[PDB]
Design a binder for this molecule. Structure first.
Ligand SMILES: CC(C)n1cc(C(=O)c2cncc(NCCc3cccnc3)n2)c2c(N)ncnc21
Length: 284
């Protein structure tokens, strides 16, 4: 028997944190507690006529199932005549993208630390049979303490008894199978992990071009290069993620799961069991 449904009147709304095609995220201070939430506001008419009800519903369903420190948390939901509100954990330090851009690229220690966190999140997600489908630095957020907080679950897939076909994520993190077989699997997220590691180190994602078509041509041909600089062990790890055959990516079920992934030499000095309680290294 939970507390009363909240209302917009219970909040003092502040700045917009971001805008999407279908939603807006706004900082709000709850008045009875003074707690700050990031409140995701979706308009019901726009959702209905853009046929997005399955996606908003999946978002709500999935977030309600997650209970882990590396995920943006859904505390509550309510609605008025026009709008839906998701009360979300407020991730103070913003997008991981912001930091890559600000410091250029990551040293080996910060790459290791954040890649390890991303790996733990995904192990947890995949253990629950959930594929993210649009993993990337824009939706890997950072809390006040600088730990990751992954978000944006409207576009997720929930497996049942490795299938999909409808949606295609952000061009650069899109996996080949989405472009050749339009089907998604947990492994699709591991491809996106390989891109993100490459990006943490190189400062830019591996497949880049002047438009989306050319990025897709590069992806299906596995057309990318490593900078000479690149941490050797991070290079070796990324080569075992950016594999065209999805049943052959490190961490996938056919490759015997997360153990071989977390054993990779690149993660040699990581203690996996308490990552969220370690003090993150400084950028930079
Ligand atoms: C950095 C800003 C923006 N931002 C987005 C947040 C989210 O939860 C969230 C929820 N759905 C999607 C998503 N990304 C995808 C892009 C986008 C941005 C804003 C609104 N629609 C979509 N992000 C968030 C948060 N919890 N705390 C602080 N800042 C936040």
């Amino acid at each position: 028997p939970q507390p009363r449904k909240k209302r917009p009147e219970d909040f003092k709304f502040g700045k917009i944190l971001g805008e999407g095609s279908f939603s807006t995220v706004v900082l709000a201070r709850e008045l009875a507690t003074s707690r700050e939430y990031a409140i995701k506001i979706l308009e019901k008419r726009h959702i209905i006529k853009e046929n997005k009800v399955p996606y908003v519903t999946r978002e709500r369903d999935v977030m309600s199932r997650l209970d882990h420190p590396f995920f943006v948390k859904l505390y509550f939901t309510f609605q008025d005549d026009e709008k839906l509100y998701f009360g979300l954990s407020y991730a103070k330090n913003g997008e991981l993208l912001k930091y890559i851009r600000k410091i250029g690229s990551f040293d080996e220690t910060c790459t290791r630390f954040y890649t390890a966190e991303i790996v733990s999140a995904l192990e947890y997600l995949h253990g629950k049979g959930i594929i993210h489908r649009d993993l990337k630095p824009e939706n890997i957020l950072l809390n006040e303490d600088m730990h990751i907080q992954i978000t944006d679950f409207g576009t997720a897939k929930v497996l049942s008894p490795a299938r999909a076909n409808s949606f295609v994520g952000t061009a650069q993190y899109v996996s080949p199978e989405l472009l050749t077989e339009k089907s998604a699997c947990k492994s699709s997220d591991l491809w996106a992990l390989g891109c993100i590691i490459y990006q943490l180190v190189a400062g830019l994602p591996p497949f880049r071009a002047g438009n989306e078509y050319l990025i897709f041509q590069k992806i299906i041909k596995l057309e990318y290069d490593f900078p000479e600089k690149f941490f050797p062990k991070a290079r070796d790890l990324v080569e075992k993620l950016l594999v065209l055959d999805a049943t052959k990516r490190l961490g996938c079920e056919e490759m015997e799961g997360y153990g071989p992934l977390k054993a990779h030499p690149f993660f040699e000095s990581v203690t996996w069991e308490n990552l969220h309680q370690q003090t993150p290294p400084k950028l930079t």
